[PDB]
Design a protein around this ligand. Structure first.
Ligand code: KD7
Ligand code: GSH
Ligand code: MG
Length: 241
């Protein structure tokens, strides 16, 4: 997160850190039920050096605050038994950049571990609405990741404006969130983490998945996120959630 601040311990109890064997934190995720996480499909693509699509190569840390304190009280460690990347994922445009991760054993709900709410298919997150982004990613483009979980406040950007800022790259599965002036943005290592929106009764709903951007926090280059309401049915059909 660029331009953010330290989160409070337990402030985002749905935020998850995904570590690949021998590599440390690679991507974020969100807890949506006792058995299921939402993340980004592009984190789980094989390359010639490592089989990122293989669920046995991963560990999920729930209730984590400080990346250097992965055994602290309240932190839960879980393996994965399945990774479901969206079948329409496009590895050139990163259309449909969303995945579902099945925990090998259920999370235990606590003051530090709690699911985010999922929006109904017909809900619209309106232009201009305040949204929170969280993660352990870089605090500057090309910089270094944060040990302590970071939070930042950004805003939904009109879809036509989004398309014009990034021509020939914004599909209807994508949403721009941030500022045209730059300054606050997600960044490398935040991929797969949730957008958190405070809704009408103060409960937090997931508004998107961190996906990509041109650099980080640059003027006229807002972060691009995978939408959530569009996938409510896909999630229900695949997880029962
Ligand atoms: C996410 O944290 C990551 N996923 C992985 C997976 C494997 C290893 C490492 C990482 S980091 C980030 C989140 C970035 C959010 N950015 C903003 N909100 N501003 N996702 C990525 O890094 C994706 N790649 C990009 O965003 C790249 C970075 C870059 C290289 S040069 C300037 N910026 N963006 C582009 O290349 C822009 C052009 C483009 C071409 C084609 C498709 C999309 C964009 C991810 C790895 C694809
Ligand atoms: S909608 C998902 C979360 N709801 C719960 O966790 C309910 C469980 C309680 N223990 C209960 O109902 O008694 C939720 O609301 N997440 C967002 C938030 O702001 O907490
Ligand atoms: Mg604690």
């Amino acid at each position: 997160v660029v331009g953010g601040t330290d989160a409070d311990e337990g402030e985002w109890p749905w935020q998850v850190s995904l570590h690949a064997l021998g590599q440390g934190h690679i991507c974020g995720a969100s807890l949506i039920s006792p058995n299921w996480l939402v993340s980004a499909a592009h984190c789980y693509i094989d390359d010639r050096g490592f089989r990122y699509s293989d669920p046995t190569q991963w560990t999920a840390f729930l209730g984590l605050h400080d990346q250097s304190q992965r055994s602290a009280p309240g932190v839960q460690e879980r393996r994965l038994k399945r990774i479901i990347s969206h079948p329409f994922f496009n590895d050139f445009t990163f259309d449909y950049d969303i995945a579902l991760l099945e925990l090998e054993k259920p999370a235990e709900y606590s003051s530090m571990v709690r699911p985010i709410c999922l929006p109904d298919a017909s809900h619209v997150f309106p232009a201009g609405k305040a949204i929170w982004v969280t993660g352990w990613g870089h605090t500057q483009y090309g910089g270094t990741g944060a040990l302590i979980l970071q939070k930042g406040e950004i805003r939904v950007i009109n879809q036509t404006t989004c398309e014009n800022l990034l021509p020939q790259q914004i599909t209807p599965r994508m949403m721009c969130v941030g500022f045209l002036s730059g300054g606050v943005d997600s960044c490398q290592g935040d991929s797969g983490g949730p957008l958190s929106s405070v809704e009408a009764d103060g409960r937090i709903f997931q508004a998107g998945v961190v996906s990509w951007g041109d650099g980080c926090a640059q003027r006229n280059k807002p972060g691009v996120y995978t939408r959530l309401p569009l996938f409510r049915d896909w999630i229900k059909e695949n997880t029962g959630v």
